[PDB]
């Protein structure tokens, strides 16, 4: 049963801003997604100190970057804390309202889109390069969910029946036709080295 939801208006306008503004420095999306993965890994690691069972769903803490030219996808996989249904449907959006407002204010004052992460809404920079984003996620005491949006003001959430994950998040970037440079090993390596070089977890770049 696929449920369809309307974004809060502020979030829909955030996504419209990212899709519509002329801004050539699109590669920062990867730093923002890798940074979110790293934070999610930090979180499960720390919580596991006071509740070691929380690693029963997988001890390994890492990030994979998986390009697939057949599907025109780039997937950022982590074994972090994952997200709950309540996260996906309501709670992330409620928080990102304030971040969106602060971000838009900073931009009018002369900030640029590369600073989006300072406002807690860097995930949406995925829409610099992706026409559609699918987020597969599994949090410990909850089911595996698939969230999906091509913007346009709505998103869907369904229980995922594809490959079970254990714990963590996959962000599947369905890249725009003119953004397939982010499927090339040389380009991804350049970007990781430039903007994600001190991440404290292994980042494996799959080959094709």
What DSSP line would sit under 154-205, residue for residue? EEEEEE--SS--SSEEEEEEEE-GGGGGGGSHHHHHHHHHHH-TT-SS-EEE
140 assigned to a ligand binding site: no
Q: Tell me the CB-side half-sphere exposure of residue 122, using CA atoms within 13 A.
A: 18
For the domain made up of 1-208, the CATH class stated in words is alpha beta
State yes or no: 26 annotated in a binding site: no
Q: Which residue is it, tokens 């996808």?
A: 73
In the numeric block, which tokens belong to residue 27?
A: 């590669």
> Do 144 and 160 contact (CB within 8 A), yes or no?
yes
Report whether 62 contacts 202 (CB < 8 A): yes
The answer to the question of whether 5 is labelled as a binding residue is no
In angstroms, the CA 174 to CA 132 distance is 5
Q: Tell me how far apart the alpha carbons of residues 144 and 168 are, in angstroms, rounded to a whole number.
A: 9
Please tell me the experimental approach by which this structure was elucidated. Answer: X-ray
Q: How far apart are CA 143 and CA 84, in angstroms?
A: 8
Between CA 11 and CA 205 the distance in angstroms is 31
Do the Cβ atoms of 95 and 120 come closer than 8 Å?
yes
So where are the chain's domains?
1-208
Which tokens in the block code for residue 26? 């699109």
Q: How many Cα atoms within 13 Å fall on the side-chain side of residue 8?
A: 17
Contact 124, 20 (CB under 8 A): no
Alpha carbons 52 and 153: distance in angstroms, whole number: 40
| Number of Cβ atoms within 10 Å of the Cβ of 4 | 10
Has 119 been labeled as part of a binding site?
no
Indicate the burial class of 131 (C-beta count within 10 angstroms; 0-12, 13-18, 19 or more). Answer: middle
User: Contact, 164 vs 82, CB < 8 A?
Assistant: no
């Amino acid at each position: 049963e696929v449920e369809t939801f309307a974004f809060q208006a502020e979030i829909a306008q955030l996504m419209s801003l990212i899709i519509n503004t002329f801004y050539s420095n699109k590669e920062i999306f990867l730093r923002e997604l890798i940074s979110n993965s790293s934070d999610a890994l930090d979180k499960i690691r720390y919580e596991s100190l006071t509740d070691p069972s929380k690693l029963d769903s997988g001890k390994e803490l890492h990030i994979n970057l998986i390009p697939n030219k057949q599907d025109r996808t780039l997937t950022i996989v982590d074994t972090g804390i994952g997200m709950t249904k309540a996260d996906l449907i309501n709670n992330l959006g409620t928080i990102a309202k304030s971040g969106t407002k602060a971000f838009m204010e900073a931009l009018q004052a002369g900030a640029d889109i590369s600073m989006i992460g300072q406002f807690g809404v860097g995930f949406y920079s995925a829409y610099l390069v992706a026409e559609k984003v699918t987020v597969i996620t599994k949090h410990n005491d909850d089911e595996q969910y698939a969230w999906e949006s091509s913007a346009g003001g709505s998103f869907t959430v369904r229980t995922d029946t594809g490959e079970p994950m254990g714990r963590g998040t996959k962000v599947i970037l369905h890249l725009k036709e003119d953004q397939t440079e982010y499927l090339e090993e040389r380009r991804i390596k350049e970007i990781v080295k430039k903007h994600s070089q001190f991440i404290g977890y292994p980042i494996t770049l799959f080959v094709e």
